[PDB]
Write an enzyme that holds these catalytic residues in place. Structure first.
Site, PDB file in Angstrom:
ATOM      1  N   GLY A 143     -32.149   0.293  37.719  1.00  0.00           N
ATOM      2  CA  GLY A 143     -32.954   1.111  36.820  1.00  0.00           C
ATOM      3  C   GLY A 143     -33.001   0.569  35.392  1.00  0.00           C
ATOM      4  O   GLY A 143     -33.832   1.016  34.595  1.00  0.00           O
TER       5      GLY A 143
ATOM      6  N   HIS B 283     -42.566  -5.968  38.801  1.00  0.00           N
ATOM      7  CA  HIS B 283     -41.948  -5.522  40.038  1.00  0.00           C
ATOM      8  C   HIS B 283     -41.844  -3.988  40.129  1.00  0.00           C
ATOM      9  O   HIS B 283     -41.412  -3.496  41.167  1.00  0.00           O
ATOM     10  CB  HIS B 283     -40.620  -6.218  40.348  1.00  0.00           C
ATOM     11  CG  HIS B 283     -39.468  -5.809  39.486  1.00  0.00           C
ATOM     12  ND1 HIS B 283     -38.857  -6.709  38.645  1.00  0.00           N
ATOM     13  CD2 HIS B 283     -38.802  -4.634  39.425  1.00  0.00           C
ATOM     14  CE1 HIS B 283     -37.856  -6.053  38.082  1.00  0.00           C
ATOM     15  NE2 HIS B 283     -37.787  -4.801  38.516  1.00  0.00           N
TER      16      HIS B 283
ATOM     17  N   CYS C 287     -34.073  -2.341  34.496  1.00  0.00           N
ATOM     18  CA  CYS C 287     -35.259  -3.197  34.383  1.00  0.00           C
ATOM     19  C   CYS C 287     -36.208  -2.685  33.318  1.00  0.00           C
ATOM     20  O   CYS C 287     -36.436  -1.475  33.243  1.00  0.00           O
ATOM     21  CB  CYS C 287     -35.966  -3.314  35.732  1.00  0.00           C
ATOM     22  SG  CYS C 287     -34.893  -3.847  37.086  1.00  0.00           S
TER      23      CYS C 287
HETATM   24  C1  LIG Z   1     -34.997  -2.194  37.797  1.00  0.00           C
HETATM   25  C2  LIG Z   1     -34.881  -2.655  39.246  1.00  0.00           C
HETATM   26  C3  LIG Z   1     -33.459  -3.013  39.615  1.00  0.00           C
HETATM   27  O1  LIG Z   1     -32.540  -2.291  39.273  1.00  0.00           O
HETATM   28  N1  LIG Z   1     -33.236  -4.184  40.283  1.00  0.00           N
HETATM   29  C4  LIG Z   1     -34.308  -4.911  40.913  1.00  0.00           C
HETATM   30  C5  LIG Z   1     -34.768  -4.547  42.175  1.00  0.00           C
HETATM   31  C6  LIG Z   1     -35.811  -5.254  42.748  1.00  0.00           C
HETATM   32  C7  LIG Z   1     -36.362  -6.324  42.051  1.00  0.00           C
HETATM   33  C8  LIG Z   1     -37.481  -7.204  42.631  1.00  0.00           C
HETATM   34  C9  LIG Z   1     -38.560  -6.384  43.341  1.00  0.00           C
HETATM   35  C10 LIG Z   1     -36.921  -8.277  43.559  1.00  0.00           C
HETATM   36  N2  LIG Z   1     -35.928  -6.687  40.833  1.00  0.00           N
HETATM   37  C11 LIG Z   1     -34.929  -5.983  40.278  1.00  0.00           C
HETATM   38  C12 LIG Z   1     -31.877  -4.779  40.420  1.00  0.00           C
HETATM   39  C13 LIG Z   1     -31.748  -6.158  41.088  1.00  0.00           C
HETATM   40  O2  LIG Z   1     -32.110  -7.173  40.500  1.00  0.00           O
HETATM   41  N3  LIG Z   1     -31.079  -6.165  42.261  1.00  0.00           N
HETATM   42  C14 LIG Z   1     -30.604  -7.361  42.870  1.00  0.00           C
HETATM   43  C15 LIG Z   1     -29.249  -7.691  42.742  1.00  0.00           C
HETATM   44  C16 LIG Z   1     -28.259  -6.759  42.091  1.00  0.00           C
HETATM   45  C17 LIG Z   1     -28.815  -8.895  43.300  1.00  0.00           C
HETATM   46  C18 LIG Z   1     -29.683  -9.718  43.993  1.00  0.00           C
HETATM   47  C19 LIG Z   1     -31.018  -9.370  44.119  1.00  0.00           C
HETATM   48  C20 LIG Z   1     -31.506  -8.191  43.557  1.00  0.00           C
HETATM   49  C21 LIG Z   1     -32.969  -7.835  43.717  1.00  0.00           C
HETATM   50  C22 LIG Z   1     -33.221  -6.721  44.721  1.00  0.00           C
HETATM   51  C23 LIG Z   1     -30.964  -4.670  39.211  1.00  0.00           C
HETATM   52  C24 LIG Z   1     -29.678  -4.163  39.336  1.00  0.00           C
HETATM   53  C25 LIG Z   1     -28.770  -4.315  38.306  1.00  0.00           C
HETATM   54  C26 LIG Z   1     -29.185  -4.958  37.157  1.00  0.00           C
HETATM   55  N4  LIG Z   1     -30.423  -5.438  36.990  1.00  0.00           N
HETATM   56  C27 LIG Z   1     -31.283  -5.278  38.004  1.00  0.00           C
END
Ligand SMILES: *CCC(=O)N(c1ccc(C(C)C)nc1)[C@@H](C(=O)Nc1c(C)cccc1CC)c1cccnc1
Ligand SMILES: *CCC(=O)N(c1ccc(C(C)C)nc1)[C@@H](C(=O)Nc1c(C)cccc1CC)c1cccnc1
EC number: 3.4.19.12
Lengths: 304, 304
Positions: A143, A41, A145
Site C-alpha cells: 500500500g 500498476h 506505492c
Molecule cells: C502498492 C503495491 C504494493 O504494495 N506492492 C506491489 C504489488 C504489485 C506490484 C506490480 C503489479 C507487480 N507492484 C507493487 C508491493 C510489492 O512490490 N510486492 C512485491 C514484493 C514484496 C516482492 C516481490 C515482488 C512484489 C510484487 C508483487 C510492495 C510491498 C512492500 C513495499 N513496496 C511495495
C-alpha cells in the site's frame, strides 16, 4: 553540534498526498496543480502482476474508474494518460496546497527524503539515498506505492522518486515523476536481482568531514594518499571510484576543517584496511554513506 | 519491508513555528491557539548566561519587547508570563493552523520526532530518544533553541520537548512544554555534566524483533535466559535493567515472531558477550536503542 540523519520538513509534500483506487487496488497519488500522479500498476489485478500489458489493461478503464480522494473529499477525474510507468489523472480542481515544485531525475549517490504513505495518508518521513545499483533501502509496506522522494530548496520541492515496488530481496525500486524507473527495473512481478551495492565514497568522506567538525577526530591519521592509490583500495572494498569532481565537491568541507581531501582519503583508507577496532564515529560502528557533501554543509550551517 | 529511523510527518508542527526576538536574541517559538511558547533564555544578554536571575531580567521587559513573527507577519503580544523555564506570550490572534494537541512529559527511553528550526523556519526533521541520563543526542546549531519534540496519534500532536541548550559535551538538554527540564539541567551557562548514558534495553529488544520480522535472523541462537541472569549481563554492559513491564510491552512482537521475550534476551546476551564479529543487523554494526516496542509495531503495521 550533533549530526543526525535528517529529512526535509514534510508539510509541503503532505498537502499533496491523495489516495487512488482503481477497482480493488488502493495506492498513493501525488496531487500537483490539476494532475494526480500515481504508479500505473494501480490498474493491475492479482493475475496481472506476472506479465501485465499496461496499454491493453488501460483500454478497459475510463475516467470514472479512477477514484481519487484527498482527505475525506472525492476529486473528479476529467482525463487520464500513461507516461512511461506513471498514470497522470487530470482532475477538475487544482490542489490549493500545491507548493512551488520541479520534477528532477537524481543520480546515484544523491540523497532525498521519503514521505511514506498508506491510503493517501502520511505515516512517516525518513532520509535515504539512491544506491549506485539504482535501488533504495526504504521502509515501505504493502500500500506504500505512490509515496514520494523529494528535496526542498527554500520553498521549491524537487520531486525525484515515486515508490513502485519491492524486489524479492527486500530492497526498493521506483521511478522519477516522469515514470522512468531508476535502474533496469520493470513494474512486473518477475525475477529482478539488483547489482552490487557499492559504497558511495564521496558521501563517506563528507560524513568523515561532519565527524571532524563535530569533534570525533580519533580516525585522523598522519598519512596522505593519491586519487589512484586510494581508488585501488576503494575497488577492493566495493567503494565507488573517487573522481576529481568528487574532490572538488568536497572543497568547502576541506576548507572549513583545514584537512585536505587526499589526507581524508588516507584516513578512510586506513579505516577500510584496519576496521574501526570497536570504536564509533558520529554514533555509528560503520562508515555512513547516505549524507552528500551538500547535506553536510546544509546541516552544519542550518539552511532553512 | 525495510526498517528506517522514521520521524512523524512534520506538517502539523511546521504550521506552529514562529520566530521570537527579545532585544538582540532570536530563537524559535511554538504558537498554539493564542499563546507562543519559547525558552525563557530569549531574554538573556551575553553577560547574563553565566548566572541569570530570570525574574529580575523579566521585570525590565514589556509585551512590546517580545517580537513574534509568523512567516512574514508580526503577531501582537498582549501578555507575557514565565512558567518554569518557558515564556508564554499571549498574542491577539489564535494560530489558524493549530492542530489538536497535548503537552506530555515523556519518560527516558521514549522516542519522539524533532523539527529543527532557525529564525522560526523549519530546516529538518529527525527521530531521537530521551536518553536514560535525560539528555538528547540531537542536531542543533546556535539559534535552534525553541525547536520542539513531538509524537502524533492520528491527528493529535503530543508535544514533549523544547530545546534549550547544548552541554559542554555536545549533548542536548531541554524542557517539556510546561518549562520543566528533563533531568537536573538548568538554563545557565555553567558546569553541567551528564550521567551514564546507558543503553535502552527494551528498545534494543524491540529492534531485534524488527530485524527478525524483516529477515535478519543470523543472531538468533539456541539459548534462553531468565530476567535475573539477563540483568546481570545488562548491568555489566551499562544496559538499563529489564523489568516484567518491559517483557509485557514486548508481548505483541514476541507473539508476531513466535520468539519468546527471554529467548530474545539470550540472543541479546550473546551479542553483548561476543560482539557482532563484523556482521550487521538492519544495516547497523551496533545495537540500536532509539526504536520503542510501540515504534516497531507502528512502522511494521503502517499506522498513519
Ligand atoms: C502498492 C503495491 C504494493 O504494495 N506492492 C506491489 C504489488 C504489485 C506490484 C506490480 C503489479 C507487480 N507492484 C507493487 C508491493 C510489492 O512490490 N510486492 C512485491 C514484493 C514484496 C516482492 C516481490 C515482488 C512484489 C510484487 C508483487 C510492495 C510491498 C512492500 C513495499 N513496496 C511495495
Ligand atoms: C538558542 C540559543 C543557543 O543557540 N544556545 C544557547 C545560548 C545561551 C543559553 C543560555 C542563556 C545559557 N542557552 C542556549 C546554544 C548553547 O546552548 N550554547 C552552549 C554550548 C554549545 C555549550 C555550553 C554552553 C552553552 C550555553 C551558552 C546552542 C547551540 C547549539 C545547540 N543548542 C543550543
Amino acid at each position: 553540534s550533533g549530526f543526525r540523519k535528517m529529512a526535509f520538513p514534510s508539510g509541503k509534500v503532505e498537502g499533496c498526498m491523495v489516495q487512488v483506487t482503481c477497482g480493488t487496488t488502493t495506492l498513493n497519488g501525488l496531487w500537483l496543480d490539476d494532475v494526480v500522479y500515481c504508479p500505473r500498476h494501480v490498474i493491475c489485478t492479482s493475475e496481472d502482476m506476472l506479465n501485465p500489458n499496461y496499454e491493453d489493461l488501460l483500454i478497459r478503464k475510463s475516467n470514472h474508474n479512477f477514484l481519487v480522494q484527498a482527505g475525506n473529499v472525492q476529486l473528479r477525474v476529467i482525463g487520464h494518460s500513461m507516461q512511461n510507468c506513471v498514470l497522470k489523472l487530470k482532475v477538475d480542481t487544482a490542489n490549493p496546497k500545491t507548493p512551488k515544485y520541479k520534477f528532477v531525475r537524481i543520480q546515484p549517490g544523491q540523497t532525498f527524503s521519503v514521505l511514506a504513505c498508506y491510503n493517501g495518508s502520511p505515516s512517516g518521513v525518513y532520509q535515504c539515498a539512491m544506491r549506485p545499483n539504482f535501488t533504495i533501502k526504504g521502509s515501505f509496506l504493502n500500500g506504500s506505492c505512490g509515496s514520494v522522494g523529494f528535496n526542498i530548496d527554500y520553498d521549491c520541492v524537487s520531486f525525484c522518486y515515486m515508490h513502485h515496488m519491492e524486489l524479492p530481496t527486500g530492497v526498493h525500486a521506483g521511478t522519477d515523476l516522469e515514470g522512468n524507473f531508476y535502474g533496469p527495473f520493470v513494474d512486473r512481478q518477475t525475477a529482478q536481482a539488483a547489482g552490487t551495492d557499492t559504497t558511495i565514497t564521496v558521501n563517506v568522506l563528507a560524513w568523515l568531514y561532519a565527524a571532524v567538525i563535530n569533534g570525533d577526530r580519533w580516525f585522523l591519521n598522519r598519512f596522505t594518499t593519491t586519487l589512484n592509490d586510494f581508488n585501488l583500495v576503494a575497488m577492493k572494498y566495493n567503494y565507488e571510484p573517487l573522481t576529481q569532481d568528487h574532490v572538488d565537491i568536497l572543497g568547502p568541507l576541506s576548507a572549513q576543517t583545514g584537512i585536505a581531501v587526499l589526507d581524508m582519503c588516507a584516513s578512510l583508507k586506513e579505516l577500510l584496511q584496519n576496521g574501526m577496532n570497536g570504536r564509533t564515529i558520529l554514533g555509528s560502528a560503520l562508515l555512513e554513506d547516505e549524507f552528500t557533501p551538500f547535506d553536510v554543509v546544509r546541516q552544519c550551517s542550518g539552511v532553512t
